[PDB]
Each structure stands twice: as structure tokens, then as C-alpha cells.
């Protein structure tokens, strides 16, 4: 249903709003993408390993929503978004431009664009 | 009130339906849908449907797809109720996003907590979305 990706370092209120919107749209279903260390460090001065960031997201979702989300490592900028016909792509101000690039690429490949849902996070 | 959404809804198109789906998934029955007054609709488009007809069109659509009659409020100023009522989320399209930012600017000036803006890029192709609540 829903694609959501991020680095999640630190896990701040903006991320929390993003996760809330993604879960409301996608249910207990969702897989959350968490960037590899390489991808994280291109975008930020990241000092937490993938496993730590992924577990921080997993425990937060369990505390707040009562399920352990599926986490997948994002090793490239597109993730699964060129191959899966997601209903919604849930993004923040920091991931919005890449969402636009994902849709531009989908359209270039004859794929339907995904509806982008940008959760503004006042950070 | 959990979620604010507003519009003229003439005609009620696939973009509006995306907005409505997102708003209902976020808020359930705890949503308020603002529909512009005739005065307000006419400043934006050459509107040929009265408020009552536009409101009923939205109500019937929501009943048909989601199984409830939504609360409709007439919007008679640019902000509707969004400077007064505390909403958790404000669901907007690219056409209404600048006004959402203005809403939060004024809320801050007035001493109200900001609302989380949820901008749906409604693309007026798109992948199919299964309408409904997910529960």
C-alpha cells in the first residue's frame, strides 16, 4: 500500500508524524525502508549504524502502535519504487525531491506515478 | 477535531477523491469537510453548482465509498474554521498548500498550535488506490 523511507537519525517528531501518516494509510502491513550506512552518510553526518536506526524505528512503532513493522534496507535512491505499484509514497520535506525523481523515472518507464503524500514537519 | 479538508469540489474529480481517501484514513469519522460557499467558489472558478448540490455530491460519494455521512461545513472565508478549531492534520493539494502554510502562520500569530500539513500531490496516470478505511 505505502512506501516510506528514511535515515531516521535521530528519530524526531517529524519522523513520528511521517510514521503516523504512513501507518494510517498503510496499516499494520507496512514495510518501512531504512537507509544503508552509505546512503545515510551521503545525506547527513550519520553516526548510528543501520541496525541501530532500524531497531529504534521498530521499537518505537511497537510502543506506539503495538506491532513490529517490517524494515528493509534501502541501498539505492529508488528502493522498491520502480517495480512495485504502491498506492502512496509518504515523504517528508527532506525526502520530497527524491519522491518527485522517483515519479519522473516511473513515468519515463511507462509506469503509473504513485501519489506522493508529503508530511510537513516544521523541524 | 482530527482532520481538516476543504474545497469547492466542482466537479468532484479523482484528485478530490485522493484527498478524501487520505483524510478519512487519517481521521475516520473525526474529519470535517469544508465546502466553499457560492461566493467563494465563483472567485476561483466559473462555478455552476450551488453549495447545496456540491455538499450533497461530496456526502453521497463518501457514503457510497466509506459508509458514513461526513460532517460538512460551509467555508465563508479563506481560513474556514482553521484559525479557531484545533485540528491534528490539514489535508491539502498543491492548489491549497500555500494557503495551508498561511493558516499555520496565522495560528502562530494568534497563539494557536500549528496543524500538521499533509500535502497530497494529486496529479491533476496514477497507481490504483483501494478506497476505504484500512482497520
**Helix and strand element order of chain A:** EHEHHEEHE
User: Which strand order does the major sheet of chain A show?
Assistant: 3-2-1-4-5
CATH superfamily of chain A, by name, is HUPs
Q: How many separate domains make up the residues of chain A?
A: 1
CATH topology descriptor of chain A: Rossmann fold
Radius of gyration of chain A: 14 Å
The CATH architecture category of chain A equals 3-Layer(aba) Sandwich
- Largest sheet of chain A, if any? 5 strands, parallel
Multimeric status of the protein: homodimer
Task: List the defining traits of the structure above.
123 residues; alpha/beta; Rossmann fold; five-stranded parallel β-sheet; 4 helices; 41% helix; 20% strand; globular; Phosphopantetheine adenylyltransferase (chain A); cytoplasm (chain A); nucleotide-binding (chain A); ATP-binding (chain A); transferase (chain A)
Short précis:
It is classed as transferase. The entry lists the keywords Protein with unknown function, Archaeoglobus fulgidus, mcsg, PSI-2, Protein Structure Initiative, Midwest Center for Structural Genomics, Coenzyme A biosynthesis, Nucleotidyltransferase, Transferase. Two copies of one chain form a homodimer. With 123 residues, chain A is of the alpha/beta class.
